Amino acid sequence: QAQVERIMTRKELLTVYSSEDGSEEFETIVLKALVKACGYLDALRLAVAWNRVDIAQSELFRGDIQWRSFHLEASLMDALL
Amino acid sequence: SNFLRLSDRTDPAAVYSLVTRTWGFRAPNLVVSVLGGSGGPVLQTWLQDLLRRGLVRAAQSTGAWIVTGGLHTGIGRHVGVAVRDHQ
């Protein structure tokens, strides 16, 4: 019980892979887990690191995220390099 | 992206003539004047799907104009992102 309590002490890192009747959508779940853990590191830079452009398309498509200049500039530099 | 500054008390006939002839825009077979405050930057998934799939698609098919507020806020931002995604 003490170990479980210490685990929950940092529950930000832990994330549950929702069964979702076998969603088999691994990249998006990984990205969500990394974003939650982070609380610079951006989902855009990671997506650029991978070759998945659809993931970044979904990330940017949602209007919830509001982007600044340097935020996109760094990702653009990464994509160019 | 043609811009213009004009007084509110302006006859719309001159504006329409300028848009149609000088700026090269064809006559609109249909005009959709989109309204809606849409409090909160986020918008529902079904509404966004409708805009990007129902409104913008129809506008391109019929060569219609979409009249909104030319600002990066409110429903104007949602309409703009729908247009961009459709493109």
CA B74 to CA A18: how far, in whole Å? 34
Size of interface A-B (CB pairs under 8 A): 12
Contacts of residue A4, Cβ cutoff 8 Å, sequence gap at least 6: none
Backbone angles phi, psi at A19, to 5 degrees: -55, -50
Chain B residues within 8 Å of chain A (Cβ atoms):
41-43, 77-78, 81, 85
Chain A residues inside the 8 Å CB shell of B85: 61
Q: Which residues pair with B32 in a beta bridge?
A: B66
Quick count: other Cβ atoms within 10 Å of Cβ A56?
19
Q: Are B68 and B40 in contact, with CB atoms under 8 Å apart? A: no
Cβ contact (<8 Å) for A61 and B42? no
Neighbours of A19 (CB within 10 A): 7
A25-A11-A51-B87 Cα dihedral, nearest 10 degrees: 70
Query: Amino acid identity of B33?
Result: S
What is the distance in angstroms between the Cα of A81 and the nearest Cα belonging to chain B? 26
| Tokens 């391109």 found at | B60
State both tokens at A12: 């930000």
Burial class (CB in 10 A: 0-12, 13-18, 19+), A46: buried
Alpha helices in B1-87 (DSSP H): 12-17, 45-50, 56-62, 74-86
**CA dist A15 → A34, B13, B26 (Å):** 9, 60, 54
Q: Residues B20, B27: contact at Cβ < 8 Å?
A: yes
Judging contacts by C-beta atoms under 8 Å, the chain A residues touching residue B81 are 61, 63
